[PDB]
Amino acid sequence: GVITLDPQTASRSLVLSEDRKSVRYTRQKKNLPDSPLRFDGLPAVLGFPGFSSGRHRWQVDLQLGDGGGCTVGVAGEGVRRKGEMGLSAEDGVWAVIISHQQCWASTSPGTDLPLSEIPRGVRVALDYEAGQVTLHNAQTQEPIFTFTASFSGKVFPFFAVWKKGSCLTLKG
């Protein structure tokens, strides 16, 4: 199922590609119009569509710039869009944060992940009725994390990326 990046949610710190399948961080903010839906404080963007039911999978390839990082997972539709405050599963973000030496799951408090290696891609699997979000290393199949939750209403693919040279690209 085709997932794309939703420009109407994208932080001004994010440049979506013309095909809306990739996104890079920009130090110079884009002139995106103000909206209550738009991330402002975190360099984040939702996917489209969101999901109310069923099993869904997608893959995110990632490149990090110097001192860079990204966040890959899922977010409840009610996720706060405004402020610089880090989001966690309390805020309805179930994601892994990847940086050059250190990856962590967005539990509350956060879980440091002792991975064989830093991923260069992440496979996300949502099972809405099972209340599970599973993350694997897309290339090696190393398990990264499994979140267990009870979902109500729509759950969206969630992405964030930061520092120059950092970028994400969606695959099937």
Residue numbers in the entry: 294 to 465
What does the paper say about this structure?
The tripartite motif (TRIM) proteins form one of the largest subfamilies of RING-type E3 ubiquitin ligases, comprising more than 80 members. TRIM family members typically contain a RING domain usually catalyzing ubiquitin transfer; one or two B-box domains mediating protein–protein interactions; and a large coiled-coil domain region, which is involved in self-association or oligomerization with other TRIM E3-ligase proteins. About two-thirds of human TRIM proteins feature a PRYSPRY domain, also known as the B30.2 domain, in their C-terminal region.
In the TRIM15 crystal structure, a reasonably pronounced pocket was observed, with a solvent-accessible area of 83 Å2 and a solvent-accessible volume of 46 Å3. TRIM15 lacks the arginine at the center of the pocket seen in TRIM10, which is replaced by an isoleucine (Ile390), resulting in a substantially more hydrophobic pocket. There are two tryptophan side chains on opposite sides of the binding pocket (Trp397 and Trp455) that provide hydrophobic docking surfaces. Trp397 is conserved in TRIM10 but adopts a different conformation in TRIM15, pointing toward the center of the pocket rather than outward.
